[PDB]
Amino acid sequence: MREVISIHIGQAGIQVGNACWELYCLEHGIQPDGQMPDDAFNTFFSETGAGKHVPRCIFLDLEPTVVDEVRTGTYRQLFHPEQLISGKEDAANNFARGHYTIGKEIVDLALDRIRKLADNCTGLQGFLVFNAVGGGTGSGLGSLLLERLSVDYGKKSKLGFTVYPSPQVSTAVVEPYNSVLSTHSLLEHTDVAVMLDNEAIYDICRRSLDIERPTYTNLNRLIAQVISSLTASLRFDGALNVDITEFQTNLVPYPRIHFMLSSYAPIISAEKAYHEQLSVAEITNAAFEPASMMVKCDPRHGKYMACCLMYRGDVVPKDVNASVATIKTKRTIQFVDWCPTGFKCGINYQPPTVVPGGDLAKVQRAVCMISNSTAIGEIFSRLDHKFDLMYAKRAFVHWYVGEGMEEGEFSEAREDLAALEKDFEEVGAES
Amino acid sequence: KSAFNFTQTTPVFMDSAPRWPKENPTWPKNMKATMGYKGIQSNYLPTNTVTLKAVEVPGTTERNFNF
Ligand SMILES: Nc1nc2c(ncn2[C@@H]2O[C@H](COP(=O)(O)OP(=O)(O)OP(=O)(O)O)[C@@H](O)[C@H]2O)c(=O)[nH]1
Ligand SMILES: [Mg+2]
């Protein structure tokens, strides 16, 4: 009934998909063989005529080398083999190949899966997109796919959880370009866009979890703890139930401004949880903490236009309204003038679940914050700088234009950032 | 118009007591009946409940009646 369709694009898309879908099979006692020993899962699965529960997701990519792992690992009896869409050759970190050369022949195979996936849910809450902006598959196909989703469905809600190019840590050289081109295609097509960087989650692994050997298998385990804390109200009973429509309604002031940050709390090892109490007021203070942000941005340079809050565990509303009241008095935290309100709070009686061999601690209280701030105009300007730094020399251009593009695509996608920059100061009018 | 005693000229001397097929505080006004409409009309059987829609696309006719 309360059903959503999850998508995974590119490598990082499916490398987080292996984390979220390791979490849900665990959060509902779903054995790796599909089956288990209603509506507690019907958000994410579908019984067949024979026992099994199959997930309603889509792993899409142009590299067989990452999809076949799913086909060989312990989670191979789960997915309908048709949902795991792959490709002969890859996009090769080029926005063109993901947009003009290869992406055009597989979308029809993808869409025929989505259509076969839409009828099997009676009420569709909205699409979930796990993108990886900075490559060819993640950015090129995510661009092309998001458009086609707008034509076939229109106003349906498409969220976006897209890892963004980090300032310092950067595993590519051309990722400036295929990031810029992606913006217009996400901006005009995605409903809400959460952002997060591979670097910002590194330091959180450094200080809090204290794992000096962090890899991608660690970061993906964090995003799982976000969405489970976000969609708990879709499949777990709890006071102040909050759905996707209620979520974007009182969080997105204008159709343009739909970028926002994320923060989880607490993030503690299995031993400091014994040197601790983790009160609801303490957690929510560490949630608004800038160091606990999942993006390398500074909230104390801008103003909060809206905040959402998904609490989880032994929490009562009397405590939420009390701690939130303190922050409203805190001067370090600003708020743009035209929101005397600014919090949509949610509660869920179901605490988060811990994965065996995981790094977090079994806790009966947790907080996942998502705030639409105007300080995010910073991380959006570094890209404006590096892009123009290289594009003034036509470097790496012969690749893009050599694959069914021209030069105009750069200037359009360039200005689309320029216009979007001033909007992040327009809304900070203060008059 | 004699032998008729018209209403416009009947001093409060003359007056009538209302009888049953008529509402009055003394006897109970038992229940009445109304017609309740078919439901929300559709292309499948009409239903009373409103449901979600997967393909929104303003001004288009797409449903999933079978669930
Ligand atoms: N959080 C997280 N980020 C990842 C992961 N794997 C890759 N990334 C990042 O994704 C970005 C590159 O995009 P990729 O998905 O690897 O490549 P692509 O987008 O599929 O494009 P192609 O290489 O042509 O297939 C880099 O910034 C990676 O750091 C992961 O497992 N977890
Ligand atoms: Mg790739």
Short mmCIF file of C-alpha atoms in Angstrom, two decimals, chain A residues 7-287:
data_model
loop_
_atom_site.label_atom_id
_atom_site.label_comp_id
_atom_site.label_asym_id
_atom_site.label_seq_id
_atom_site.Cartn_x
_atom_site.Cartn_y
_atom_site.Cartn_z
CA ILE A 7 16.71 2.89 -8.14
CA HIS A 8 20.49 2.48 -8.22
CA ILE A 9 22.62 3.96 -11.01
CA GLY A 10 26.31 3.58 -11.68
CA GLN A 11 28.79 1.91 -9.38
CA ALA A 12 28.23 3.93 -6.21
CA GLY A 13 24.51 3.54 -6.84
CA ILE A 14 24.73 -0.23 -6.54
CA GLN A 15 27.51 -0.14 -3.96
CA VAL A 16 25.09 1.66 -1.69
CA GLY A 17 22.33 -0.65 -2.92
CA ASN A 18 24.31 -3.55 -1.48
CA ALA A 19 24.21 -1.74 1.87
CA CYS A 20 20.56 -0.67 2.00
CA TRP A 21 19.38 -4.06 0.76
CA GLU A 22 21.62 -5.82 3.26
CA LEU A 23 19.84 -3.72 5.89
CA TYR A 24 16.22 -4.34 4.92
CA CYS A 25 16.63 -8.10 4.51
CA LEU A 26 17.98 -7.87 8.06
CA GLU A 27 15.46 -5.35 9.39
CA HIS A 28 12.56 -7.68 8.52
CA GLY A 29 14.17 -11.07 9.17
CA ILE A 30 14.35 -11.80 5.43
CA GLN A 31 16.83 -14.63 4.90
CA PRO A 32 19.16 -14.21 1.90
CA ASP A 33 17.09 -16.91 0.17
CA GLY A 34 14.13 -14.57 -0.29
CA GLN A 35 11.95 -16.20 2.34
CA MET A 36 11.66 -15.73 6.11
CA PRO A 37 10.91 -18.03 9.07
CA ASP A 38 1.84 -7.76 6.52
CA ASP A 39 2.84 -4.26 5.33
CA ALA A 40 5.89 -4.42 7.61
CA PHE A 41 7.87 -4.90 4.39
CA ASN A 42 5.28 -4.37 1.64
CA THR A 43 6.95 -1.02 1.10
CA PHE A 44 9.99 -2.78 -0.38
CA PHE A 45 9.05 -6.35 -1.39
CA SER A 46 6.35 -8.47 -3.06
CA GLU A 47 5.38 -12.04 -2.22
CA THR A 48 5.43 -14.48 -5.13
CA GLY A 49 3.30 -17.61 -5.30
CA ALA A 50 6.16 -19.56 -3.68
CA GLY A 51 7.28 -18.23 -0.33
CA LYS A 52 9.79 -15.65 -1.45
CA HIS A 53 9.87 -11.88 -0.96
CA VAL A 54 11.52 -10.12 -3.90
CA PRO A 55 12.68 -6.49 -3.56
CA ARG A 56 11.13 -3.74 -5.67
CA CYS A 57 14.38 -2.07 -6.69
CA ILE A 58 16.50 -1.73 -9.84
CA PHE A 59 20.28 -2.07 -10.13
CA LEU A 60 21.29 -0.33 -13.36
CA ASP A 61 24.80 0.11 -14.72
CA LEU A 62 27.04 -0.21 -17.76
CA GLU A 63 29.67 -2.40 -16.04
CA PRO A 64 29.12 -6.17 -15.73
CA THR A 65 32.01 -6.39 -13.26
CA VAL A 66 29.97 -4.92 -10.39
CA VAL A 67 26.61 -6.44 -11.23
CA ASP A 68 27.96 -9.99 -11.48
CA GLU A 69 29.22 -9.75 -7.90
CA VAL A 70 25.58 -9.45 -6.85
CA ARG A 71 24.89 -12.43 -9.10
CA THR A 72 27.52 -14.52 -7.28
CA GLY A 73 27.42 -13.23 -3.69
CA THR A 74 25.09 -14.53 -1.01
CA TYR A 75 22.39 -12.11 -2.20
CA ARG A 76 21.83 -13.75 -5.58
CA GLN A 77 18.64 -15.73 -4.93
CA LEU A 78 16.98 -12.44 -3.92
CA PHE A 79 16.66 -10.29 -7.01
CA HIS A 80 14.60 -11.14 -10.03
CA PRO A 81 17.44 -11.58 -12.55
CA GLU A 82 15.73 -9.17 -14.94
CA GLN A 83 15.90 -6.22 -12.54
CA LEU A 84 19.72 -6.32 -12.43
CA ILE A 85 20.30 -4.48 -15.70
CA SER A 86 23.87 -4.31 -16.99
CA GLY A 87 25.69 -3.26 -20.16
CA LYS A 88 28.36 -4.54 -22.50
CA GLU A 89 30.71 -1.54 -22.29
CA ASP A 90 30.81 1.32 -19.80
CA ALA A 91 30.54 5.09 -20.08
CA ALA A 92 34.25 5.61 -19.28
CA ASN A 93 33.80 8.68 -17.05
CA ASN A 94 32.30 10.72 -19.86
CA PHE A 95 28.96 12.50 -19.69
CA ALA A 96 28.43 12.06 -23.43
CA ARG A 97 28.62 8.26 -23.48
CA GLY A 98 26.13 8.11 -20.64
CA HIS A 99 23.86 10.55 -22.44
CA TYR A 100 24.18 10.17 -26.22
CA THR A 101 25.99 6.98 -27.21
CA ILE A 102 25.15 4.07 -24.90
CA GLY A 103 22.36 5.25 -22.61
CA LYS A 104 19.88 5.50 -25.46
CA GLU A 105 19.52 1.78 -26.21
CA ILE A 106 19.03 0.39 -22.69
CA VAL A 107 16.50 2.83 -21.20
CA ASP A 108 13.64 1.05 -22.97
CA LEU A 109 14.78 -2.14 -21.24
CA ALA A 110 14.87 -0.24 -17.95
CA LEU A 111 11.49 1.45 -18.44
CA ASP A 112 9.79 -1.85 -19.28
CA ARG A 113 10.99 -2.97 -15.86
CA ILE A 114 9.70 0.17 -14.14
CA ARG A 115 6.30 -0.23 -15.80
CA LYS A 116 6.21 -3.88 -14.78
CA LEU A 117 7.22 -2.56 -11.34
CA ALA A 118 4.58 0.18 -11.13
CA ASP A 119 1.51 -2.01 -11.59
CA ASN A 120 2.62 -4.32 -8.77
CA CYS A 121 2.20 -1.50 -6.22
CA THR A 122 -1.31 -0.27 -5.54
CA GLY A 123 -0.24 3.11 -4.15
CA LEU A 124 3.08 4.61 -5.23
CA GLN A 125 4.55 7.08 -2.74
CA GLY A 126 7.49 8.09 -4.92
CA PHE A 127 10.73 7.08 -6.58
CA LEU A 128 14.04 6.90 -4.72
CA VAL A 129 17.17 7.64 -6.76
CA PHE A 130 20.66 6.73 -5.53
CA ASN A 131 22.91 8.59 -7.95
CA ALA A 132 26.67 9.14 -8.13
CA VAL A 133 27.39 12.49 -9.77
CA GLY A 134 30.90 12.53 -11.20
CA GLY A 135 31.06 9.59 -13.57
CA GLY A 136 29.61 8.62 -16.92
CA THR A 137 27.03 6.07 -15.82
CA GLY A 138 25.95 7.91 -12.69
CA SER A 139 25.73 11.33 -14.30
CA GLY A 140 25.08 10.57 -17.97
CA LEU A 141 22.41 7.92 -17.47
CA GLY A 142 20.98 9.54 -14.35
CA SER A 143 20.48 12.62 -16.50
CA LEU A 144 18.82 10.71 -19.33
CA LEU A 145 16.81 8.46 -17.02
CA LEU A 146 15.41 11.22 -14.80
CA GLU A 147 13.98 13.01 -17.83
CA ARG A 148 12.14 9.95 -19.13
CA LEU A 149 10.75 9.45 -15.63
CA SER A 150 9.29 12.96 -15.80
CA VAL A 151 7.55 12.36 -19.14
CA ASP A 152 6.04 9.02 -18.14
CA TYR A 153 5.01 10.06 -14.62
CA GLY A 154 5.13 13.85 -14.41
CA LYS A 155 4.55 15.19 -10.91
CA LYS A 156 5.39 11.95 -9.09
CA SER A 157 7.92 12.49 -6.31
CA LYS A 158 11.50 11.53 -7.19
CA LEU A 159 13.99 11.93 -4.38
CA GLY A 160 17.69 12.21 -5.05
CA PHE A 161 20.52 10.91 -2.86
CA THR A 162 23.45 11.84 -5.07
CA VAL A 163 27.03 11.76 -3.86
CA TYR A 164 28.69 14.98 -4.97
CA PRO A 165 32.28 15.84 -5.96
CA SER A 166 34.27 16.63 -2.82
CA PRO A 167 36.59 19.66 -2.63
CA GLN A 168 39.87 17.97 -1.67
CA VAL A 169 39.33 14.22 -2.01
CA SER A 170 38.66 13.55 -5.69
CA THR A 171 39.26 10.25 -7.48
CA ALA A 172 38.84 11.79 -10.94
CA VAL A 173 40.08 14.66 -13.10
CA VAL A 174 37.12 15.14 -15.44
CA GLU A 175 34.47 14.90 -12.69
CA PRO A 176 34.07 18.71 -12.77
CA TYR A 177 32.46 18.48 -16.22
CA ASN A 178 30.04 15.57 -15.89
CA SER A 179 28.89 17.11 -12.60
CA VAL A 180 27.91 20.44 -14.16
CA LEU A 181 26.05 18.89 -17.10
CA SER A 182 24.09 16.80 -14.59
CA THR A 183 22.68 19.78 -12.68
CA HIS A 184 20.07 20.95 -15.19
CA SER A 185 18.87 17.39 -15.69
CA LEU A 186 18.48 16.82 -11.97
CA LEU A 187 17.25 20.33 -11.13
CA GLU A 188 14.33 20.27 -13.56
CA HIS A 189 13.51 16.61 -12.97
CA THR A 190 14.19 15.58 -9.37
CA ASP A 191 11.71 16.61 -6.70
CA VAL A 192 14.07 16.68 -3.70
CA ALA A 193 17.86 16.36 -3.76
CA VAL A 194 19.77 15.28 -0.67
CA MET A 195 23.53 15.61 -1.03
CA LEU A 196 26.54 14.00 0.62
CA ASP A 197 30.27 13.80 -0.13
CA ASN A 198 32.75 10.97 0.21
CA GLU A 199 35.08 13.20 2.23
CA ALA A 200 32.55 14.55 4.72
CA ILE A 201 31.72 10.99 5.75
CA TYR A 202 35.42 10.17 6.08
CA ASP A 203 36.02 12.46 9.05
CA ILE A 204 32.83 11.20 10.69
CA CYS A 205 34.42 7.76 10.36
CA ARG A 206 37.60 9.24 11.85
CA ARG A 207 36.38 11.01 14.99
CA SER A 208 33.22 9.13 15.90
CA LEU A 209 33.57 5.52 14.76
CA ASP A 210 37.37 5.74 15.12
CA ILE A 211 38.07 3.35 12.25
CA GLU A 212 41.41 4.45 10.81
CA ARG A 213 40.85 1.96 7.96
CA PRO A 214 37.73 3.36 6.27
CA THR A 215 36.69 2.13 2.85
CA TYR A 216 33.54 2.42 0.77
CA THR A 217 32.02 -0.59 2.54
CA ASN A 218 31.91 1.63 5.63
CA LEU A 219 30.32 4.72 4.09
CA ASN A 220 27.58 2.72 2.41
CA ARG A 221 26.71 1.28 5.82
CA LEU A 222 25.96 4.83 6.97
CA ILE A 223 23.51 5.77 4.21
CA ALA A 224 21.56 2.62 5.04
CA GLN A 225 21.11 3.98 8.55
CA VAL A 226 19.77 7.22 7.06
CA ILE A 227 17.05 5.85 4.79
CA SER A 228 15.94 3.25 7.33
CA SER A 229 15.52 6.16 9.74
CA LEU A 230 13.76 8.09 6.97
CA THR A 231 11.29 5.48 5.71
CA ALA A 232 10.46 4.01 9.12
CA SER A 233 7.18 5.93 9.05
CA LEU A 234 6.42 4.13 5.78
CA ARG A 235 6.56 0.68 7.37
CA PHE A 236 6.77 1.07 11.18
CA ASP A 237 4.08 2.40 13.50
CA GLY A 238 4.99 5.55 15.38
CA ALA A 239 3.58 8.84 16.64
CA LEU A 240 3.68 11.75 14.20
CA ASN A 241 3.78 9.55 11.12
CA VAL A 242 5.45 11.38 8.23
CA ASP A 243 5.32 10.32 4.58
CA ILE A 244 7.13 11.57 1.49
CA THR A 245 4.43 14.04 0.45
CA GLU A 246 4.31 15.54 3.94
CA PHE A 247 8.10 15.62 3.80
CA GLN A 248 8.70 17.78 0.73
CA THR A 249 5.60 19.91 1.36
CA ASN A 250 6.92 21.74 4.44
CA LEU A 251 10.59 21.63 3.43
CA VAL A 252 10.91 23.07 -0.10
CA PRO A 253 10.00 26.78 -0.13
CA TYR A 254 10.40 27.28 -3.89
CA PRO A 255 10.42 24.86 -6.83
CA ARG A 256 14.09 25.68 -7.40
CA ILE A 257 15.55 25.33 -3.91
CA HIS A 258 15.46 21.58 -3.28
CA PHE A 259 19.01 20.86 -2.12
CA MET A 260 19.61 19.94 1.50
CA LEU A 261 22.07 18.36 3.91
CA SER A 262 21.87 15.40 6.28
CA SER A 263 23.07 14.58 9.77
CA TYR A 264 22.81 11.40 11.81
CA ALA A 265 23.21 11.06 15.56
CA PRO A 266 24.46 9.43 17.59
CA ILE A 267 27.51 7.91 15.89
CA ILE A 268 29.34 6.00 18.61
CA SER A 269 31.44 2.86 18.95
CA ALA A 270 30.28 -0.17 20.92
CA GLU A 271 32.35 0.87 23.96
CA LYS A 272 31.76 4.61 24.41
CA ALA A 273 28.06 3.73 24.49
CA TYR A 274 28.97 2.56 28.00
CA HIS A 275 30.54 5.96 28.78
CA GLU A 276 27.31 7.68 27.85
CA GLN A 277 23.58 8.26 28.34
CA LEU A 278 22.46 9.63 24.92
CA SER A 279 19.58 11.82 26.04
CA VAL A 280 17.19 13.15 23.41
CA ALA A 281 18.45 16.68 24.07
CA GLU A 282 22.10 15.66 23.73
CA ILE A 283 21.51 13.77 20.47
CA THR A 284 19.64 16.61 18.80
CA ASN A 285 22.45 18.99 19.74
CA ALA A 286 24.96 16.72 18.02
CA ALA A 287 22.56 16.53 15.07
#
